[PDB]
Ligand binder design. Structure first.
Ligand SMILES: *Cc1c(COP(=O)(O)O)cnc(C)c1O
Lengths: 180, 711, 62, 238
């Protein structure tokens, strides 16, 4: 488990350093004529995610407080181009909005008065680390349950119990720190 | 080529009268007549004037002072020496290549002499030129075929349009007529390799000492991909060097192979060292085979000899220790390692034929020589499969090549034969050593700081300075002796800013500020960054460009000691942001940038970020297959640590690949992330000094963006 | 049996080399858009890793 | 891929692990091959060869040699509607002028508009029937497809240091044809070609003996592309 917990804890801190709330539009490499964009990676994974805005506007002769876009349709407009279709207030059909790219790397939804409105994403242990940490923690409890029943053997020296128990508590003290 | 020299004056009349009659006859056939003075005058009309082809002098006056010095500069140079009655040869004139044409002092026969000089000059043109270039020049004046390719047909379609006449009058009539394709039988075809094209390959390989050579008409980047498609089948193992080029990056993304990267040495100033001799052993290569999944015995090796800076290797030890039957030496920066006694046994072509092995070289032609763009060569020393290696050339070259580049590609090989070509390599070395001595001379005698040349303390000799282990100028920890050599023509200027132990100093001027000052006068810096420079001193750099570089360096010290303004020194940098660069002087900007280098710690975050190699999960060919389908997402600058990248990172400075397209950045390569964050925090406070990384584009907040694959 | 089979093959190839003037060997001359020509040997006529060849006029080699 | 392909197209099939399907263009007895019949572009003909060919799925790309080496234009008004291929290629390496004349409308891939759900790729040769230096070509893209994927293949074949002497002449071919001053070269070449065709028939009957013949219909008074009908004997295509 030291070769496994020593890598998961090292991977846990590797992902924690990677990551009020604004949506910063990011770019990719390669060589392209115009400018292609893309949504956030591991931050958002839902198909029908919602996006918040600061200054409200009057779109389609009505007010709106949150605009939801489709993940399958957002990957095509930000890469192939054309027009985007999105509903309002999570209801109705996916109407066409006047969304374009901003100079400050944001999503400005234009209206009939040419107004600015910077969009934002709602705020929230990765799923990959949690899947491997729970499987490793269950393996430590199974090995500790076997030792917590056969330790009463009379033919075992007393000085060995001070090193076997210390090796198990050292692993348990480290596996409970990364899950905090 | 129409300069005729008439040396000395006998004083008599029966010898000067035929000279006056010949003076009026040679001008009728377009020839320039010059009258040199003493013996030292004629010697200056050959080294400086290359368009000379006629030397007229008295044979019974200087029969040994002229036949010896001229032979040391040109072999086929015609000598129109006039002999007398009691004239004879000398015993010391048997082992000298000369062309002496005897005549007399007869009156009235000056017209017949002019016809003999014109015919002799025509024989000199048809001899020094290769049969491929000679046939191209003759085809313009005689060959007039119709219904051929291309459609311009010597510039005929351009004479029927108003916009086409401006493009035709720019080049010339002989330029458009020389652009012919495969529609000519008396010149052959480049892809067919027959006729004049067959003898052209045997001529270039003989001059550059090789068994077989090719004429790549698609740049050096194509020649690097032809070799890779030979000793690397669909599922093998190659030994590519870490300090590779963008052309070598796409080679690993087109063939399903498993490359093994080496660990070259380096110092603190950013100078790329070399690969140690321990990596070429048999136990070292075989150890990385088991550790790398899906990898067999390596059958190909790529060595960057020399690197981008200019440090040669030791081929006498690699051809014996490195047990690879396909060793590649990317000689894209040293196309002269042959015609000099201080370069024997230092390249792949120098030496004999190694049994069971072969040496590959891709010497650049339009880099440090004299030819049109998109030109390269493939040097092979041994026995290779020409029936298969040539198949990779047609995959990147069209069936109708441009013969204007082929005529210039072979011309560079013809300009090296003889004493007229040997003085071009040695002439650039003498001008380079002289420039190195002028820096040390103007360093102690000056009053203050001055530039320094990355050279040993003793430069009196004229050879390649070896990188020993008991020196402090190279600054390489544990370097192998008799393995790394110094390029004399590659002068590496070191700006004051660091110490001899690898630390920093209080007073220092970065090399990025000096690079912008040289561009104002027209001097383009080849390589710049922390505290180092680089210039190209090839055969085309005469004494004018060498002396003009020192004058621009002395002007930088005067403008910095007197504390001048940025507007009154750098007009190009002031136009980028006049508001920020208003009340700023040359001393305020040079000190603010130097403090950021010490604060952000540049030498430490750079030396530790290139030693640890990223964990290569899959082959680079598998990373390109995911991009073809559309499985590439986007992450932040800090989220790329732990994912599989898709593009190669080429940060400036220095200019080496950071992460290969297909390698995962783990916690073992910690300084790699710290090196990217260091360049972003330093190039976001001053206009003109932005961070240049080929893979991390600039956004609008400060943090850059990359591209990885999907999970 | 190896030293005995070689005598049978030697006697068989002796009668085949006497009438070898009926069909000889010919290699193609591929060109079109390529440099040096290619050389190969017999195709499926010999289904073994070690093929045999017959000559007309014998010589003294080695 | 078309059956009448060039040597350059042969090496393309040897570098990509794909399963090409070859067609059967029309042909006569004089060696002049016609074109692919309209029955091969149907949905029942393409799907029939998929099951018969092992390791082959739905075709996603189609290469059509238009025109051929002899110079026979096809009918793009029928291919862009019947052929259900999202990436139809037209090897226009011999007709870099099907735009500057009204007798070439609706005959190439660039003539018309954008096909919904399809893209047109053409490799028009520049140093063949125009006016530019050697090693020059163009790639016409008509559609909204991915460009980054198509752009990565350009740097793998072209070096990082191009020759600007050819780029200046490649764009010049597009500037020499713009305007009425450039359109006279296309119409002038057609008038000189039709005049040369009439001089052969004039020197054939008036002559005394055999004479050359032009593969042309019996009526050449018009100035347009002569269609290959089914009630003629000059083409000889059954
Ligand atoms: C400059 C360079 C190239 C590119 O050369 P081109 O002929 O212009 O394509 C390729 N490899 C190396 C090592 C280079 O330095």
């Amino acid at each position: 488990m030291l070769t496994r917990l020593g890598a998961i804890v090292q991977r846990h801190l590797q992902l924690q350093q990677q990551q009020k709330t604004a949506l910063t539009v990011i770019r990719l490499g390669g060589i392209f004529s115009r400018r292609q964009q893309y949504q956030l990676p591991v931050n958002v994974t839902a198909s029908t995610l919602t996006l918040l805005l600061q200054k409200p506007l009057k779109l389609h002769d009505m007010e709106v407080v949150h605009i939801s876009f489709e993940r399958s349709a957002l990957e095509q407009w930000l890469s192939k181009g054309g027009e985007i279709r999105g509903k309002l207030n999570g209801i109705g059909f996916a109407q066409k909005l006047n969304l374009e790219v901003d100079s400050a790397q944001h999503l400005v939804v234009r209206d009939v008065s040419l107004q600015g409105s910077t969009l934002a994403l709602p705020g929230s242990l990765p799923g990959e680390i949690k899947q491997q940490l729970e499987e490793l923690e269950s393996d430590w409890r199974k090995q500790h349950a076997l030792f917590s029943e056969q330790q009463k053997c009379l033919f075992i020296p007393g000085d060995w119990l001070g090193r076997i128990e210390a090796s198990l508590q050292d692993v348990g003290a480290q596996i409970r720190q990364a899950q905090q | 080529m129409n300069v005729i020299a008439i040396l000395n004056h006998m004083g008599v009349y029966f010898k000067e009268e035929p000279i006056r009659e010949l003076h009026r006859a040679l001008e009728r056939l377009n020839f320039q007549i010059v009258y040199p003075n003493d013996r030292d005058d004629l010697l200056k009309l050959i080294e400086n004037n290359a368009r000379l082809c006629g030397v007229i002098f008295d044979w019974d006056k200087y029969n040994l002072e002229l036949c010896e010095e001229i032979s040391k500069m040109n072999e086929n140079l015609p000598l129109y020496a006039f002999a007398n009655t009691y004239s004879t040869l000398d015993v010391s004139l048997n082992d000298l290549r000369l062309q002496i044409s005897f005549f007399e002092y007869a009156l009235g026969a000056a017209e017949d002499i002019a016809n003999k000089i014109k015919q002799t000059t025509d024989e000199y043109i048809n001899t020094i030129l290769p049969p491929l270039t000679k046939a191209l020049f003759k085809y313009v004046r005689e060959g007039k075929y119709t219904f051929c390719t291309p459609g311009h047909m010597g510039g005929t379609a351009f004479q029927k349009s108003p916009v086409g006449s401006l493009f035709y009058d720019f080049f010339g009539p002989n330029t458009m007529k020389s652009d012919i394709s495969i529609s000519v039988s008396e010149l052959g075809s480049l892809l067919d390799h027959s006729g004049p094209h067959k003898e052209a390959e045997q001529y270039i390989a003989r001059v550059f000492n090789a068994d077989r050579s090719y004429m790549v008409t698609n740049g050096t980047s194509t020649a690097n991909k032809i070799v890779g498609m030979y000793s690397a089948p669909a599922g093998s193992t190659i030994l590519i060097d870490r300090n590779c080029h963008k052309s070598l990056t796409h080679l690993m993304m087109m063939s399903d192979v498993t490359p093994i990267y080496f660990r070259p040495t380096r110092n603190a100033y950013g100078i790329l060292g070399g690969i140690p001799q321990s990596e070429f052993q048999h136990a070292t290569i075989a150890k990385r085979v088991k550790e790398t999944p899906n990898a067999t015995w390596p059958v190909h090796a790529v060595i960057t000899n020399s690197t981008y800076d200019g440090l040669l290797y030791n081929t006498d030890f690699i051809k014996k220790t490195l047990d690879v039957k396909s060793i590649h030496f990317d000689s894209a920066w040293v196309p002269y390692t042959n015609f000099s006694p201080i370069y024997e046994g230092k390249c792949g072509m120098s030496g004999g034929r190694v049994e069971g092995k072969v040496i590959y070289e891709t010497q650049s032609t339009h880099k440090l020589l004299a030819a049109f763009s998109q030109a390269s060569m493939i040097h092979v020393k041994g026995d290779v499969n020409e029936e298969t290696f040539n198949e990779a050339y047609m995959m990147h070259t069209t069936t109708s090549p441009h013969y204007g580049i082929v005529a210039s590609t072979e011309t560079a090989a013809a300009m090296m034969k003889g004493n007229a070509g040997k003085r071009l390599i040695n002439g650039s070395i003498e001008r380079a050593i002289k420039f190195r001595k002028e820096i040390k001379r103007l360093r102690t005698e000056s009053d203050g700081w001055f530039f320094d040349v990355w050279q040993p303390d003793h430069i009196d000799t004229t050879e390649c300075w070896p990188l020993r282990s008991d020196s402090t100028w190279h600054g390489f920890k544990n370097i192998d002796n008799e393995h790394m050599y110094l390029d004399p023509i590659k002068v590496t200027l070191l700006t004051p800013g660091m110490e001899k132990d690898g630390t920093m100093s209080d007073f220092g001027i970065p090399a990025s500020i000096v690079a912008k000052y040289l561009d104002e006068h027209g001097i383009v810096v080849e390589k710049t960054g922390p505290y180092n420079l680089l210039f190209l001193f090839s055969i085309g750099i005469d004494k004018t460009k060498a002396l003009s570089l020192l004058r621009a360096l002395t002007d930088f010290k005067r403008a910095f000691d007197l504390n001048l303004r940025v507007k009154n020194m750098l007009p190009s940098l002031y136009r980028e942001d006049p508001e920020f660069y208003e009340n700023m002087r040359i001393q305020e900007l040079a000190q603010n940038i130097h403090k950021l280098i010490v604060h952000h710690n540049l030498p430490d975050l750079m030396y530790r970020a290139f030693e640890v190699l990223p964990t290569m999960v899959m082959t680079p060919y598998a990373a390109f297959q995911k991009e073809l389908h559309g499985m590439t997402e986007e992450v932040y600058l800090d989220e790329m640590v732990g994912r599989i990248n898709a593009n190669m990172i080429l940060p400036y400075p220095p200019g080496v690949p950071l992460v290969m397209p297909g390698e995962m950045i783990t916690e073992e390569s910690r300084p790699v992330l710290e090196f990217l964050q260091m360049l972003c925090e330093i190039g976001a406070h001053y206009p003109g000094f932005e961070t240049d990384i080929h893979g991390a584009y600039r956004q609008a907040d400060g943090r850059y963006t990359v591209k990885v694959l999907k999970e | 049996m190896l030293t005995r089979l070689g005598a049978i093959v030697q006697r068989h190839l002796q009668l085949q080399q006497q009438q070898s003037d009926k069909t000889a060997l010919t290699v193609i001359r591929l060109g079109g858009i390529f440099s040096r020509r290619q050389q190969y040997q017999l195709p499926v006529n010999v289904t073994a890793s070690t093929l045999t060849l017959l000559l007309q006029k014998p010589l003294k080699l080695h």
